Amino acid sequence: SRTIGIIGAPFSKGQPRGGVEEGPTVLRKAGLLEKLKEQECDVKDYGDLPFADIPNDSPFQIVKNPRSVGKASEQLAGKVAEVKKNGRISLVLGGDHSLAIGSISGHARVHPDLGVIWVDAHTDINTPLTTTSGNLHGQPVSFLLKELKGKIPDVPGFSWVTPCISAKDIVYIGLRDVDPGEHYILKTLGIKYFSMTEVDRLGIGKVMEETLSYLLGRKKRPIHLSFDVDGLDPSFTPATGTPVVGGLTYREGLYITEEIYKTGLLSGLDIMEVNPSLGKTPEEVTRTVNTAVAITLACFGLAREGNHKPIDYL
Amino acid sequence: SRTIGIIGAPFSKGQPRGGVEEGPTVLRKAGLLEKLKEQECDVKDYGDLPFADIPNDSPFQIVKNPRSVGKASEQLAGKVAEVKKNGRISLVLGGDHSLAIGSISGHARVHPDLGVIWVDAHTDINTPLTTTSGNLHGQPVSFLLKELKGKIPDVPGFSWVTPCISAKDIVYIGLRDVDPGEHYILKTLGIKYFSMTEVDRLGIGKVMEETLSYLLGRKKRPIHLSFDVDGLDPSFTPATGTPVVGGLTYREGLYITEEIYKTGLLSGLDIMEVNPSLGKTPEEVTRTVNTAVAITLACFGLAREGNHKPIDYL
Amino acid sequence: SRTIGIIGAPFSKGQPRGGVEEGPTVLRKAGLLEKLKEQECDVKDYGDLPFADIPNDSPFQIVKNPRSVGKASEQLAGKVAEVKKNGRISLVLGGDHSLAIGSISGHARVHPDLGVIWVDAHTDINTPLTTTSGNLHGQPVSFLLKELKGKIPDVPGFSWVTPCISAKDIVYIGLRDVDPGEHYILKTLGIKYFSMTEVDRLGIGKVMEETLSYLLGRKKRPIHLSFDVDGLDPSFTPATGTPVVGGLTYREGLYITEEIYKTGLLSGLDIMEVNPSLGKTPEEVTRTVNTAVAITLACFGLAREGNHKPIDYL
Ligand SMILES: N[C@](CCCC[B-](O)(O)O)(CCN1CCCCC1)C(=O)O
Ligand SMILES: N[C@](CCCC[B-](O)(O)O)(CCN1CCCCC1)C(=O)O
Ligand SMILES: N[C@](CCCC[B-](O)(O)O)(CCN1CCCCC1)C(=O)O
Ligand SMILES: [Mn+2]
Ligand SMILES: [Mn+2]
Ligand SMILES: [Mn+2]
Ligand SMILES: [Mn+2]
Ligand SMILES: [Mn+2]
Ligand SMILES: [Mn+2]
């Protein structure tokens, strides 16, 4: 049975806009925990993380808020490892995507053999040196990849980081706004990716087959799904900081997560970048939160074909 | 040549909301009959059915308005059988989906070998015992299936019903909100279905190929298409009683119906659950009615590639 | 390297509505030339064409503004041939689609072996005799096809036209509103087409593979892409004169143009039928222009997976 440990991560300093901190709150108030319980799920809530203010946090070169971002991820890694040791699937409610450094790092402490599926409009693989924005939510993958050690400078706040995945252990789905440095890294390291071009070419059906065969073909292993809500088209998730048109549909989002659930190997989940304050209308917030909840429920067994308990309904 | 008998079925008591009775009216005022004539069609209008008021209709256990629903379907079955005996394709304008009991039953009197394609967000296969709503528009398939006789109680109003299809004679397309009891029946009886998950997996092209091969592979036979407008996404058909997000697109809807037309075997058609009173704006009503008309026109030969008469246009 | 010659064609008299003349202006003000320069491109601007007023232009039978349309295309053919002789890809900003007579004709003077890809909701293949509207933007293909000479009357303004393509040298993508005479011609001449039905059936991936294999399988040759913005769904390009629902998505539009870019054979491009005055809101205009610019940028190398210069980014 599929058993979850919920971790709230109200953190925003990996990017400029403030409202992403309210991510955990609006998802919970949408009745996420209750809805999980209403399906097959054993849910334990490990609460929202207290991220202390680090008021003295001047840029490292162009990299903004490095100490705050680093500490938040350090804290999150500790909590994720704790929930994993308790035999539960970690469900991190973000919060900006810089937290993926902490989420994946903590997960990997307990399950070093994890494979990562990254659903996003962006690769989030800028280094502190290639970034032109300095926003750390556009950099987390570079901190995790072994191949890029010695390319990442000693950024204050990140001394605790030990890269825990290789180029072969991650697959991107949804990419349509990739920086030139990022594209260079992508091609250089030979990372498997399905940009929107590939999804258009192959269909999401083949994308998922290829994705799961790629990661699980050799050996079954724990899956970490890091889901940036901006992976989906802004017509479905508008209340987010860096929306890009031409995204994955609602249907494609549910297909990805249904197929992932059915492997029985989902081990860690990030639901990131929901910013209710960026909704142009109340309905836009509602639509974004509703979609994020739907995505989450699919990850833990809710199937569009229907679900039933193991009894005779007739 | 493709020859039609139109039957209006202004009936609503299979569900709570009243405006679905206006279905026939708004479709006709959209110029449906004229547009059919403007393509290849021989159209006879058998008028709107007069459904008498049965004011004494207390629930049967939780099942609501059983006598009214039963009589409406009994009447409709008689009219459908009449149009079929006249060598015409019955076109039923609904009205709520409980009327499918009458439509399919009457059709099957004349053509017992029919196969059913059911386009819907829902399976509509609750029994009077499994339903939690009591709304009969969520139950019609259970009354039609031979396998489920002895599971259906003697509901007042339905003594005339004799189940006329087996589990193998129906294919669902579009399913994304299926009750647990319904999912149990679906899996137990081995009914062929393409939920939105399958449509996402395979593409509507393969779905239609599989659907038609399934029903027609052994032997050519009459097709009954029961089309709930909520099968399509609410972005296309919002003025309907039980909308569910993540539906079939407009394009997928036309593809389904184009492919069905081209078999030359369409024998019965239901266009159900249009409720103009549920449109949030006049445009939403217009959009819903326009889409329903477009779907209908495709069923009778209107092709997106173009149509032409058998002459030399040059 | 991919090298462009921009030609503004502010012309509207191939159809009734006036604002399409502002096409070049709003695309340029959207920063199109700058954005092309911001990617790999050598851009020369050959300016906007001065189309003299021909006030004496009474209908030829039902065909409207024949002399004005004919002269505009004659002028455009001269400019396109000039840019082609200069070793550049002609980029024509329309303007209504009647200008395709001039664009393709001029291109073909320099590269007689061109193949045409026509992205549109319409076939634009009515002759002056089959048209029921008389609008010349619905007729340009008939003037270009060799097979139809002797079917085209001596329309004033078009004596300069010499048909330059055969039935085999054109592929349509996007068709969903085709007149009966047009469908007759399509089927009679055996022209390759992918209506929305085929796109639904096969997926845009297979459509592009088949399209390019069809045109380029035997021999590599220059490609002319004539892109009517109404090929895309009106949810993406609403500010256009003849919108039709159920169109190609934004994603499909970018996939078509990405795949075309990657052949290295794009030789001529038309971006047609943008009419800012038909936007119901400022945002609709913006959305239409934004989409058209995005389509154009994809034709000249902008890839959703990312782009990078030939250096070491690390
Ligand atoms: N690549 C960006 C966006 C990162 C998004 C983070 B994610 O996916 O968690 O939301 C954007 C860089 N871009 C450079 C030029 C254009 C504007 C900013 C960056 O800041 O590095
Ligand atoms: N399955 C439902 C909806 C039926 C829709 C009828 B159709 O497709 O003609 O429109 C809904 C049951 N559901 C149970 C719990 C949630 C709310 C109601 C039911 O009432 O049985
Ligand atoms: N086929 C039409 C539309 C042409 C669109 C031109 B394009 O693709 O550049 O935008 C429409 C003919 N139709 C006949 C009956 C219905 C209304 C007009 C025509 O005018 O010939
Ligand atoms: Mn992102
Ligand atoms: Mn991200
Ligand atoms: Mn339904
Ligand atoms: Mn139904
Ligand atoms: Mn057009
Ligand atoms: Mn056109």
Q: What is the CATH number of the domain that holds B150?
A: 3.40.800.10
Task: Note whether A167 contacts C: Cβ–Cβ < 8 A.
Answer: no
Residue C229 C-alpha to ligand 3 middle, in angstroms? 14
Tell me how far CA of residue C105 lies from CA of B279, C100, C158, in angstroms: 50, 8, 12
Residue B271: domain span = 1-314
Q: Using DSSP, state whether B121 is helix, strand or coil.
A: coil
How many alpha carbons lie under 13 Å from residue C143 in its C-beta half-sphere?
31
User: Residue A84 is encoded by which pair of tokens?
Assistant: 């994993």
Q: Which of B94, B111, B104 is nearest to B48 (CA)?
A: B94
Is the distance from the beta carbon of residue C120 to the nearest atom of ligand 3 less than 6 Å? yes
Nearest chain A residue (CA) to B182: A306
Rounded to the nearest angstrom, the minimum Cα separation between A297 and chain B is: 14
Query: Among this protein's residues, is B107 annotated catalytic?
Result: no
Q: Which of C121, C79, C100, C94 is nearest to C26 (CA)?
A: C94
Q: Before A94, cis peptide (omega within 30)?
A: no
Residues of A in contact with B182 (CB under 8 A): 306
Please state, in angstroms and as integers, the Cα–Cα distance from residue B270 to each residue in B98, B146, C89, following that order.
11, 21, 53
Residue C203, by phi and psi: left (phi above 0), alpha (psi -120 to 50) or beta? left
Indicate the residue type of A226. S
- List the subunits that have 3+ CB pairs under 8 angstroms with C: A, B
Closest ligand to C-alpha of residue A127 is 1
Structure tokens at B143: 């009354």
Q: Is C52 on the interface with A (CB under 8 A)?
A: no
Nearest CA in chain A to C305: A195
Spatial contact of A43 and A36, defined as CB atoms under 8 Å apart: yes
Longest CA pairwise span in chain A (Å): 67
| Nearest CB neighbour to A304, from listed B130, B187, B196 | B196
Q: Do A304 and B123 touch (CB under 8 A)?
A: no
Crossing angle between the packed helical segments B250-262 and B282-299, to the nearest 10 degrees: 20
Closest CA to A132 of A66, A183, A68, A179: A179
CB C97 within 8 A of CB C228: yes
Distance of CA B8 to the CA centre of its chain: 13
Give the integer Cα–Cα distance in Å for C130 and C250: 32
Q: How many angstroms separate the CA atoms of B258 and B313, rounded?
A: 24
Asked if A106 contacts A162 with a C-beta cutoff of 8 angstroms, the reply is no
Is B137 annotated as catalytic? yes
Distance CA C236, CA A295 (A): 26
Which of C251, C258, C305 is closest, CB to CB, to A183?
Answer: C305
Kindly list the residues from chain B whose CB atom is less than 8 angstroms away from the CB atom of residue A254: 196-197, 200, 246
Count other Cβ atoms within 10 Å, centred on residue A55: 7
Task: Give yes or no for a contact between A165 and A100, defined as CB atoms under 8 angstroms apart.
Answer: no
Question: Residue C313 and residue A180: Cβ atoms within 8 Å?
Answer: yes
Residue C44 makes CB contacts below 8 A (sequence gap 6+) with C4, C5, C6, C83, C86, C88
d(CA A111, CA A80): 11
Q: Is A183 annotated as a binding residue?
A: no
Dist. CA A152–CA A130, nearest whole Å? 10
Report how far residue C154's alpha carbon sits from residue C61's, in angstroms, rounded to the nearest whole number: 11
| CA neighbours closer than 13 Å in the CB half-sphere of residue A240 | 31
Q: How far is CA B261 from the centre of its chain?
A: 15
The answer to the question of whether A115 is labelled as a binding residue is no
B204 touches chain C (CB under 8 A): yes
Strand partners, A8: A48, A93
Q: Is C313 in contact with A184 (Cβ distance < 8 A)? A: yes
CB neighbour burial string for C252-270, b if at least 16 within 10 angstroms, e if fewer = bbbbbbbbbbeeebbbbbb
- Is there a contact between C200 and B314 if contact means CB atoms under 8 Å apart? no
Check the annotation: does C183 bind a ligand: no
**What residues pair up with A248 in beta bridges, in sequence order?**
A232
Residue A292, strand partner residues:
none
CA nearest to B232, candidates B123, B137, B119: B119
C128 in Cβ contact with C139 (< 8 Å): yes
Chain centre distance of CA A308 = 29
CB neighbours of residue C135 within 10 Å: 24
Task: Identify whether the C-beta of residue C294 lies closer than 8 Å to the C-beta of residue A233.
Answer: no
What's the rounded Cα separation, in Å, for the pair C97 and A182?
Answer: 39
Question: Tokens for C86?
Answer: 């200069």
Q: Which residue has the tokens 């064609």?
A: C9
- Method of determination is X-ray
Query: Which sign does the torsion angle of CA B270, B276, B279, B282 carry?
Result: positive
Rounded to the nearest 10 degrees, the angle between the axes of helix C100-110 and helix C66-85 is 30
Q: Which atom belonging to ligand 1 lies closest to the Cα atom of A140?
A: 9
Active-site annotation holds for B111: no
Residues 6+ apart with CB under 8 A from B162: B105
Residues A4, A43 contacting (CB under 8 angstroms): yes
Residue C303 forms contact with A (CB below 8 Å): yes
The ligand 2 atom nearest the CA atom of B120? 8
Q: Provide CB contacts within 8 A for A248, sequence distance 6+.
A: A119, A173, A174, A196, A199, A204, A231, A232, A233, A256
Q: Are the Cβ atoms of A252 and B184 closer than 8 angstroms?
A: no
Q: Which uninterrupted H or E stretch holds A27? A: helix A23-29
C246 touches B at CB < 8 Å: yes
- The CB density around residue B235, as the number of other CB atoms within 10 Å, is 15
Scan for tokens 């991220």, then name that residue.
A51
Contact C311, C48 (CB under 8 A): no
* Atom of ligand 1 lying closest to residue A134 CA: 20
Residue B42 φ then ψ, to 5° = -95, 105
Q: Which residues contact A279 (CB under 8 A, 6 or more apart)?
A: A238, A239, A285, A286, A288
Q: In angstroms, what CA-CA distances link B153 with A277, A312, B130, B158? A: 53, 17, 11, 10
CA distance C244 to B304: 11
CB C299 within 8 A of CB C264: no
Return the partners of chain A (3 or more C-beta pairs < 8 Å): B, C
Contact between A4 and A91 under an 8 Å Cβ cutoff? The reply is yes
Quote the CA–CA distance of C27 and C270 in Å, as a whole number. Answer: 13
CA distance A169 to A216: 10
C47: phi > 0 → left, psi -120 to 50 → alpha, else beta; which? Answer: left
Say how many domains are in chain A: 1
Catalytic annotation present for C120? yes
Residue of C179, C201, C248, C280 to mutate for B, most B C-beta atoms under 10 A: C201
* Angstrom distance (rounded) from CA B13 to CA B69: 6
Q: Are C183 and B311 in contact (CB under 8 A)?
A: no
User: What is the distance between the alpha carbons of residues C249 and C271, in angstroms, rounded to a whole number?
Assistant: 17
- C12, C72 contact by CB (below 8 A): no
B130 contacts B102 by C-beta, under 8 angstroms = no
User: Of the candidates A182, A188, A201, which has its C-beta nearest C205's C-beta?
Assistant: A201
The secondary structure of chain C as a DSSP string is --EEEEEEE---TTSS-GGGGGHHHHHHHTTHHHHHHTTT-EEEEEEE-----------BTTB-SHHHHHHHHHHHHHHHHHHHHTT-EEEEEES-GGGHHHHHHHHHHH-TT-EEEEESSS-----TTT-SS--GGG-HHHHHBGGGTTTS---TT-TT----B-GGGEEEE------HHHHHHHHHHT-EEE-HHHHHHH-HHHHHHHHHHHHHSSS---EEEEEEGGGB-TTT--SSSS--SS-B-HHHHHHHHHHHHHTT-EEEEEEE---GGG-SSHHHHHHHHHHHHHHHHHHTT--TT----SS---
- Assess whether A122 carries a catalytic annotation: yes
CA-to-CA distance for B225 and B119, rounded, in angstroms? Answer: 8
| Residue of C225, C241, C120 lying closest to C182 (CA atoms) | C120
User: Quick check: CB of C237 below 6 Å from ligand 3?
Assistant: no
Kindly report the nearest CA distance between residue C204 and chain A, in angstroms: 7
C185·B258 Cβ contact <8 A: no
Helix ranges, A190-303 (H)? 196-202, 204-216, 250-262, 282-299
Q: Which residues are C269's β-sheet partners?
A: C91, C225
Residue A22 structure tokens = 């309210």
Q: For residue C90, count other CB atoms closer than 10 A to its CB.
A: 26
**CA gap C28, B201 in Å, rounded:** 41
Q: Is C46 exposed, middle or buried (0-12, 13-18, 19+ CB in 10 A)?
A: middle
Q: What is the A228 CA–ligand 4 centroid distance (Å)? A: 6
Whether residue B84 contacts residue B103, with contact meaning beta carbons closer than 8 Å, is answered with: no
Q: Between β-strands B115-119 and A223-228, what pairing exists: parallel, antiparallel or unpaired?
A: unpaired
Measured in whole angstroms, how far is the alpha carbon of residue B115 from the centre of its chain?
A: 13
Which residues, judged by CB distance below 6 Å to any ligand atom, belong to the binding site of ligand 1? A 97, 120, 122, 124, 126, 131-133, 135, 137-138, 179, 228, 230, 242, 273
**Is C130 near chain B, with CB under 8 Å?**
yes
Nearest residue of chain C to residue A150 (CA atoms): C314
Backbone phi and psi for residue B173, each to the nearest 5 degrees, phi listed first: -135, 125
By C-alpha distance, which of B133, B170, B178, B126 is closest to B152? B126
* C165/C112 Cα distance (integer angstroms): 8
Residue with tokens 């919108």: C243
How many degrees, rounded to 5, is the angle at CA C216 between CA C213 and CA C218? 100
- Judge whether A182 and C311 are in contact, CB under 8 Å: no
Sign of the four-CA dihedral B89, B94, B97, B99: negative
Known catalytic membership, residue A42: no
> How many of the other CB atoms lie within 10 Å of CB of A256?
27
Q: Which atom of ligand 1 is nearest to the CA of A98?
A: 9
d(CA C243, CA C228): 10
Residue nearest to atom 21 of ligand 3 (CA): C138
Rounded Cα distance between C71 and C63, Å, is 15
